[PDB]
Amino acid sequence: TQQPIVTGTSVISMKYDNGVIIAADNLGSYGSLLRFNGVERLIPVGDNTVVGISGDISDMQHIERLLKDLVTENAYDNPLADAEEALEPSYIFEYLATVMYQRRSKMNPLWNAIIVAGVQSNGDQFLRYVNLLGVTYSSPTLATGFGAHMANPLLRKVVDRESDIPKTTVQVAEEAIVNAMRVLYYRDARSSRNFSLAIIDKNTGLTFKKNLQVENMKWDFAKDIKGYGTQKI
Amino acid sequence: GYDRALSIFSPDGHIFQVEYALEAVKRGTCAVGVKGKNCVVLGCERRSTLKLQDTRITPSKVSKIDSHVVLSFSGLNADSRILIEKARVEAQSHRLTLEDPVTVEYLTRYVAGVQQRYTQSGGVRPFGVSTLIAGFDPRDDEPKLYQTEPSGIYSSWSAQTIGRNSKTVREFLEKNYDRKEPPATVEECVKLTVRSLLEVVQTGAKNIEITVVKPDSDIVALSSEEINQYVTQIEQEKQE
Amino acid sequence: TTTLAFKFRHGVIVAADSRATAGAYIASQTVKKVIEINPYLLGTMAGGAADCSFWERLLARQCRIYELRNKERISVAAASKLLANMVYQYKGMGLSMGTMICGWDKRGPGLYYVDSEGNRISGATFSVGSGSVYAYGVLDSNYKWDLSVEDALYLGKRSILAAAHRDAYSGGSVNLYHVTEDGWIYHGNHDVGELFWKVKEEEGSFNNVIG
Amino acid sequence: QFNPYGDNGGTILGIAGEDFAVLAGDTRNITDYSINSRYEPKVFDCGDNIVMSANGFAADGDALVKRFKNSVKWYHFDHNDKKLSINSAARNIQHLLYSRRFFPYYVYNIIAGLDEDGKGAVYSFDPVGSYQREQCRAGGAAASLIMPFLDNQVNFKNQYEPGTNGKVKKPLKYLSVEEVIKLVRDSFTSATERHIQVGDGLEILIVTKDGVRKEFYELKRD
Amino acid sequence: NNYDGDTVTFSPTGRLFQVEYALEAIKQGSVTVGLRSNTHAVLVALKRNADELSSYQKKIIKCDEHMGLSLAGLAPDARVLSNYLRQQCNYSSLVFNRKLAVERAGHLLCDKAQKNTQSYGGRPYGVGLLIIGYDKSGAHLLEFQPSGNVTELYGTAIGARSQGAKTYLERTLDTFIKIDGNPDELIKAGVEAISQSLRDESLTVDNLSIAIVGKDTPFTIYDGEAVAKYI
Amino acid sequence: GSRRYDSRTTIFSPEGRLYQVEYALESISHAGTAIGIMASDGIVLAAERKVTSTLLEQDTSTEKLYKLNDKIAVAVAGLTADAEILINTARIHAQNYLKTYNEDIPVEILVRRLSDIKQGYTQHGGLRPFGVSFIYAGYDDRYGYQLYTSNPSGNYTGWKAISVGANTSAAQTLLQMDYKDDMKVDDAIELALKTLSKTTDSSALTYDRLEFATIRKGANDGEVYQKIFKPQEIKDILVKTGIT
Amino acid sequence: DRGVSTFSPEGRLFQVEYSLEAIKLGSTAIGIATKEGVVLGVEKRATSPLLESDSIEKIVEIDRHIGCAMSGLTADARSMIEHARTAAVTHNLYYDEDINVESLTQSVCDLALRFGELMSRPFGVALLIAGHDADDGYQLFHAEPSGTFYRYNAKAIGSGSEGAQAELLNEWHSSLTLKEAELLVLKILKQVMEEKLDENNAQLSCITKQDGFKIYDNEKTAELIKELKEKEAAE
Amino acid sequence: MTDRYSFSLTTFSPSGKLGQIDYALTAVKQGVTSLGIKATNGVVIATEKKSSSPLAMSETLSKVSLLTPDIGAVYSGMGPDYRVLVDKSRKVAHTSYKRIYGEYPPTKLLVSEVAKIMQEATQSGGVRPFGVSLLIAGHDEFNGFSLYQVDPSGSYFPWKATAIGKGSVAAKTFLEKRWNDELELEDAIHIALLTLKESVEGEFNGDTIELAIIGDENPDLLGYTGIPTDKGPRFRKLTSQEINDRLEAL
Ligand SMILES: *[C@@](C)(CO)[C@](*)(O)[C@H](CC(C)C)NC(=O)[C@H](Cc1ccccc1)NC(=O)[C@H](CC(C)C)NC(=O)[C@H](CCc1ccccc1)NC(=O)CN1CCOCC1
Ligand SMILES: [Mg+2]
Secondary structure, eight states: OOOOOEEEOOEEEEEETTEEEEEEEOOEEETTEEEESOOOOEEEOTTSEEEEEEEEHHHHHHHHHHHHHHHHHHHTTOTTTTTTTSOOHHHHHHHHHHHHHHHHHTTOOOOEEEEEEEEOTTSOEEEEEEETTOOEEEOSEEEOTTHHHHHHHHHTTTOSSGGGSTTOOHHHHHHHHHHHHHHHHHHOTTOOSEEEEEEEETTTEEEEEEEEEOOSOOOGGGGGOOSSSSOOO | OOOOOOSOBOTTSOBHHHHHHHHHHHHSOOEEEEEOSSOEEEEEEOOTTOOSBOTTTSOOSSEESSSSEEEEEEEOHHHHHHHHHHHHHHHHHHHHHHSSOOOHHHHHHHHHHHHHHTTSSTTBOOOOEEEEEEEOOTTOOSOEEEEEOTTOOEEEBSEEEESTTHHHHHHHHHHHOOSSSOOOSHHHHHHHHHHHHHTTSSOSSTTEEEEEEETTTEEEEOOHHHHHHHHHHHHHHHOO | OOEEEEEETTEEEEEEOOOEEETTEEEESOOOOEEEEETTEEEEOOBOHHHHHHHHHHHHHHHHHHHHHHSSOOOHHHHHHHHHHHHHHTTTTTOOBEEEEEEEETTEEEEEEEETTSOEEEOSEEEESTTHHHHHHHHHHHOOSSOOHHHHHHHHHHHHHHHHHHOTTOOSEEEEEEEETTEEEEEEEEEHHHHHHHHHHHHOOOTTSOO | OOOOOOOOOOEEEEEEOSSOEEEEEEOOEEETTEEEESOOOOOEEEETTEEEEEEESHHHHHHHHHHHHHHHHHHHHHTTTOOOOHHHHHHHHHHHHHTTTTSOOOEEEEEEEEOTTSOEEEEEEOTTSOEEEESEEEEETTHHHHHHHHHHHTSOTTOBOTTTSSSSBOOOOOOOHHHHHHHHHHHHHHHHHHOTTOOSEEEEEEEETTEEEEEEEEOOOO | OOSOSSTTOOOTTSOOHHHHHHHHHHHHSOOEEEEEOSSEEEEEEEOOBSSSSBOBOOOEEEEETTEEEEEEEOHHHHHHHHHHHHHHHHHHHHHHSOOOOHHHHHHHHHHHHHHHHHSSSOOOOOEEEEEEEEETTEEEEEEEOTTSOEEEOSEEEESTTHHHHHHHHHHHHHHHTTOOSOHHHHHHHHHHHHGGGOOSOOOOTTTEEEEEEETTEEEEEEOGGGGGGGO | OGGGGOOOSSOBOTTSOBHHHHHHHHHHTTSOOEEEEEETTEEEEEEEOOSOOTTBOOTTOOSSEEESSSSEEEEEEEOHHHHHHHHHHHHHHHHHHHHHHSSOOOHHHHHHHHHHHHHHHHHBSSOOOOOEEEEEEEEETTTEEEEEEEOTTOOEEEESEEEESTTHHHHHHHHHHHOOTTOOHHHHHHHHHHHHHHHOSSSSOOGGGEEEEEEESOSSSSOOEEEEOOHHHHHHHHHHHTOO | OOOTTOBOTTSOBHHHHHHHHHHHTSOOEEEEEOSSOEEEEEEOOOSSTTBOGGGOOOEEEEETTEEEEEEESGGGHHHHHHHHHHHHHHHHHHHSSOOOHHHHHHHHHHHHTOBOOOBSSOOSEEEEEEEEETTTEEEEEEEOTTSOEEEBSEEEESTTHHHHHHHHHHHOOTTOOHHHHHHHHHHHHHHHOSSOOOTTTEEEEEEETTTEEEEOOHHHHHHHHHHHHHHHTTO | OOOOOOSBSOOBOTTSOBHHHHHHHHHHHHSOOEEEEEOSSOEEEEEEOOOSOTTSOTTSSOSSEEEETTEEEEEEEOHHHHHHHHHHHHHHHIIIIIHHHSSOOOHHHHHHHHHHHHHHTTTSBTOOOOOEEEEEEEEETTTEEEEEEEOTTSOEEEBSEEEESTTHHHHHHHHHHHOOTTOOHHHHHHHHHHHHHHHOOSOOSTTTEEEEEEOSOOGGGTOOOSOTTOOOOSEEEOOHHHHHHHHHTO
16 A cells, blocks of 8 residues: 555547557646656557556656556567567557456556557557556547546547447547647646647557647736636736 | 376286285284183284394384274384374264264274375375284174285184284184184183284294283283193194 | 254254335345255354345355265364354454254254354354344243254244244245254245234234234 | 455346346446446356346455356366356356355356257355345345346236135246346346346347347436 | 486586476377468367276367467476467457567567576476467468477477378478368368377377367367368 | 485385384494483492593583583483583473473473484475484382483383493493482492493593493482582592593 | 485386386276266275274265265275365355366366375275266266376276176166166176185175265165076076 | 586495595694693683794684683694684574674574584585594683583584593593692683693794683773773783793793
8 A cells, every 4th residue: 555656647548440549748746846847647559559548657657668568578579579479559558457346456546547559460559547456448529537537528528339339430540639738737736738649540550749838818807807707906 | 296107007907016025924923813601812023133123112013003902013113103193093082973982993994094095196105014803892792803014905714813924823714723613711812813923923932922802902912931831732733 | 134043952043134225215024044065954044135145156166066075064163163163264354144043953953143243152052133122032931852843843934924024124925944863844934914814813913903 | 544445336247037037237337436347247147058247346346256167168178068057157157256255256246048958047145145046036236136036027026816805826837938038127227226236238139049049128317 | 317407407418308398298198289371270189088988188279369279298288388479479460450460479488488598496387379360461270399499380280190291291391381271171181180190099079189270260169060070 | 206216214114114213323423421320329320531632611511411400401312412412402391391380391301302303204294303312310109210321212211220322232241230219319320320331432531531420319408409510620629530 | 215296218207107007906996977867886895804894994985976986095085085075166156056076077187297305105906986967967977096097987906906897897887777777786796706705705886866975775776696696597 | 517426425434434534633642732621710721832843833823712702612634624713603602692692602502503514515416525624612601611522513512621642542641630629710821831742843933833822801901991891802822921831830
């Protein structure tokens, strides 16, 4: 049993017709202190999977090392390591989910919430969640922390059920994700303007975008707001 | 730990260490067991090479395992103490867990199991001991007499002997003991047990020990004079 | 729960209700609180359903290996003691069991109370469970040794009914057993709903209730 | 302080027929007042004509199912591809549950299938392995809403025959699969109205001698 | 001679005699054949009986839905190694949700057998195994020797008189590899291959044992009247 | 591996004897003779030191007679180093008993414990046995004065008079001849020294080649006193009995 | 000396082969499987007339549906029987059912090769394991110290085994009744035994679906012996 | 790996001999001569510094070792075996005595502990006996001065004076003629130097001889003042110069 020290906030994601999108901001908070501004919380595994992590950053860095070692180990005595016997999103997820549940069962958890996003061999979209309790679930949209409360409602307006996935393009899906990240910046006190975004498409592969910023913000209406009720000046 | 396999098979299918343990039993002093109609008698040889002995304190050949069961033996004396201690512990453990004293058959099965375990365990040699276990089951008036040996096999006997010159006394018992009509009284049972030892013992003085076990935990060891009276009567009838 | 058992001339009667509870919610009403360990041994269950079920099923397996090694059916005293020693290892760890080991052996009919606290008691009359206190009134007032099998079965049945009526956590149906030297005999499942009205009319009891 | 348990909601329901059995459960997964998934399967075909659903704390339910599926696999290996009977599975599951008597699987569990006489069977388990064969059983969040309805509409409790006035009961006539599925849908539609953790979807698994069939029905998404 | 008392001793020419003696136990064992195409992989085994009253010792063991083997030599050692494969296949499924690659299964068997050849007290395994399977890279056939050596092959045979079947497969190589989408014809080629190792005795209904795995075919074993079709 | 170099210390011979026990007894037969004699009013322990030197410090020396507790003593025959290992164990056992039951350990119980330890080395462990034979002289309120012996086999027996070490055959015959049941300590002292004087391999029996001890109720009223004789006291008793 | 787990140049384990020689010295045990049941019979072979023969226990119950006969170093069988009984009852605990005869036999045979430098040597005893289950019906197995087990229609182990097996070769057919099998075991035992066969030095037993495993009384066997003598004198 | 030699390497032969102990004693016989003499007011122990090479600095190799402030040791036989025994002897004096009773052990009990260690190497699994005989000189309040010999078997004997190693038989004879119960420490040192000269071939001086005494308390060697009851170590190693001074009056 511990407590989280340096933390990462929401990770958000959704499926679209040809793949998945996942995003997360670049902040490592230390309680109310916005300590570390250059933290990457999206971690690619091969060219077909991206693991997005929230929660304790020291535990994130540990998981990041487990994944790096997983790739190394899969290549051992494996001539098809860059082909048929490459790591799949479903393999990577089940491994993490196994570790998370084992750690909670020893009362010494990895204080994280994880979303594994990727595309399988057969072109199927993979998107599944796992957390410190070993709890797992899948949905067309997934989000951790505050994103679960604010992002999911917005993303579910695009993909409300399974049948809406083929009707959703990459331009529409990215637009929705970017908007959700803006909303979280308005409303989450432990968020940052700077974020990273990753797209895993079955045709165009893995596209990893860094140093993105929340833009097109609305603040001008603030000038007209005066006092808390009766004040006029 | 010392894990060496000492008891192993030989090309002809023999475990020599177990068979050599039987040779240690052959060397040991003679022990005999005879069950009557309402009793069991255990006779034991004492070799008279050792005089100046203190008979008060010297370890007796017949050992009580519980109040209703006794155990005599032939072979290595030091080895017998280990089996007796284990048997005594098990007897109390049985009373403690099952709220009944052990049956004679159960106690025998335990002791025999210990002997067997030492024939296929690493780093240990077999017990150079054969035992005669006798007594009466709780709330039962049927006499019980069992034998064990180093290999671990056990069986029930109407009458049996073990140790040196046991071949001779077994020969005597086979022709003298009648199954249809066993020794009806304690006297007849003790007399037959003393007679059998007199075939082998040498002198009938302090060389013969007798222990009578009767039902309901009634166990007593005869004295030198009491036994000497049997020795006297036997030979006086023989002079004819 | 309500369970009871008592020794008498013609063996031992065993009776129990069938209710299972999770707070105020009645989760089940078809629970068998009497476990058949062997054709001559019964066990009752009270408290932790899971605990009672597991340990008494594990005991039945101990009692069976006993019969194989010894060529002899285990005694009621030995069986009760194996259970007692098993649960004593986990004392203070949270187990909740209130059991009675009923049977017929060499010493005649036997009846032992065993619990997770550590008690192991031989006795002619027992009742354990939340409704035991109500059942004891009927038992103590009508219990003889010279009781007919018919009257003894009724007494155990009527005793559970008394408890099932008053105790909120007791009811459903009554399971009856009679243990003889030729083994135990199941005497049916009796719905308390129907049984109550029947007894009320035939006996005249429960005058305060309208029907 | 770290709490190793959670509540993922959900409700399940098993009904045994004369020559069939059904195991139903909603597809909603939740934490507190949030929805995790509107379609997250909870009832599984475990092999040998057995269906199972364990939930409450999803992570413990997933592990138990995963272990029992594994137990079936090894039962075949060790006993010459013998079919695991429903009564044998039930007893096996008890021992999986009690192995953690001092750190329990926080779940409600129900299995369903056919007994060795071909008749429908439903077994119910508490978190630590107390199990019971029953004709009708609901488990989970809205179990208390559904069970009284099933006592009335499956076992005809408190129902008597008109004219007699309480003297003669309603006779226990068996139910068909079509009649049972109606009770299942009505049970879950009623539970969806009054319980916030129940909704989104309803997945039913029907078990016959022919095998295991699925049916899916939508529920309210509020 | 002086260097065959245990597994921990090289001979002066660099040989390990206890391993070679374990290899000898395989040659005494009954014949078994393995072969594959691009779609399917087949095991064929000649079972052996003690006498006419006895049953015919089973030769084929299932490891997973997509993998299994046939044995030749000490049957208990095959039970130990197959149990290990069952666990490893199972670990891969439970932890990684991944069917174990046949090549990796061979690497694990090699490493398990090797430990028994370098340490004091233990002994080498006295059995040879033919592993077949269908994974993400198609059909596979492996040959396991208790020296530790594992080899991927198109076809092979082990046991007594196995050289006859191995020569046949070496001729038929170009034909049976092309038998795609036709399980019965691939088994026929296997039954015809194992027939080259028979003397005096012939293939009867309770003598023959066949197993197959493929693209849309789980590992299944055929015995009794199920193989009368191929006699 | 290691099997090649294992002597296998705990095995039977074809005749049913324990090789190492028999060879340990052979070792003990070359050790200095130790004699124990039990009388009605006490026990005597006499023992011969092995070929000493004039430069050996005798008054601070101890190779034969050791104290286990206030009531029990032992005479040693064999490897002294092996004996000290066992003696310290016996001292601890005696104290454990006293702590547990608040009574002095009965003699036989102490003897049985040591003999069981010896037995263990003959049946398991693969180690050589202790090359030691003890004569236990002790007193308790059950059996009174007691003499026991134990040997590497772990077998023990009770005696009225007994010898261990060298020339036991000759020594036992001499003891069997002159011993009587109504004998007293002063007479037993004389018998022990006379027996050593006749069985010794040395030219003459002197004070510097002996260790001597008595266990007497010759302590003021109902109690027991152990007396380990000093060099000068051994010299005096040799003159008194008429040996020097 | 040499390792306990050593292979011979022929590819056999020395110790396993030597234990088989010990089994050849053991008393005879015979098993015959029919569609009406499986019969088990043994030679008691008392070493002396004073030995109470009814204490010789070479036929043993494992469960209600499984019996067992032994031959060789019989003391070694006790821990095997103990394991078998535990395995049978443990499976009933975990699965609420009877255990398959083959599965029970496999569990016993798993102990066999657990020896090295675990126990110090192989078992010096062979077992005939007979039983019934719902899947494969009446079955007879021969469990060796090699870890191998064969199923048999009929089998003889012990000193008179090869002579008895040849006799079982000719006599066994798939339509044998239980009564016919009983007489057949008695016939072959009488043939290979040194001493004259009677109810005191030989013992019969059977396993049926209805009544389960039963050891025959000496009075019951005596009648079957008398019935055998008369039918042999009939031609 | 694992130490698989769990069995005894020293065993009784048919004649009753413990071979490895006898062979260990033979190694002691080949070793350089060392001796010890007990006086009324002290004890002396001495040996030859047999230098393996003239390039080797023989001052760095100490054959005579301090075990406690009042107990010293010297050996004959295998040097490395002695060095480890000294390390163990020093430690056991603390662990099995000083940390319990708050004072250093008396000579006889420290000897008893060293003996035990050597006995165990004679019975325990997978080890050979120590190939050394020790001479341990010491003083304690209640026993006074004392000198003990310890053999490979673990047996120990107290001596008025003795010698071990190469020329022990001749040296013990020499000591028997010269020893009496009225010797002062200086007389014992003189006799020690005379006895040791007979067994030495080459150079005989302070640089080739190692000699130490157990005598009076040395407050100058204590290293601190302020506690009256602490009066300093009785063990003292004689310097090269101090030996040479006594070789002129030889
Ligand atoms: C009378 C009826 C009541 O006193 C009897 O004593 C019966 C005995 C029969 C059932 C053998 N006892 C009960 O009904 C017993 C009461 C009880 C409850 C909890 C602990 C001890 C005693 N009830 C149970 O055992 C129920 C049986 C279920 C409903 C089938 N089990 C539970 O309540 C389980 C077991 C809990 C548990 C025990 C030990 C460690 C961990 C957990 N608990 C749950 O299902 C969780 N519960 C569900 C309802 O909501 C609250 C949480
Ligand atoms: Mg118990």
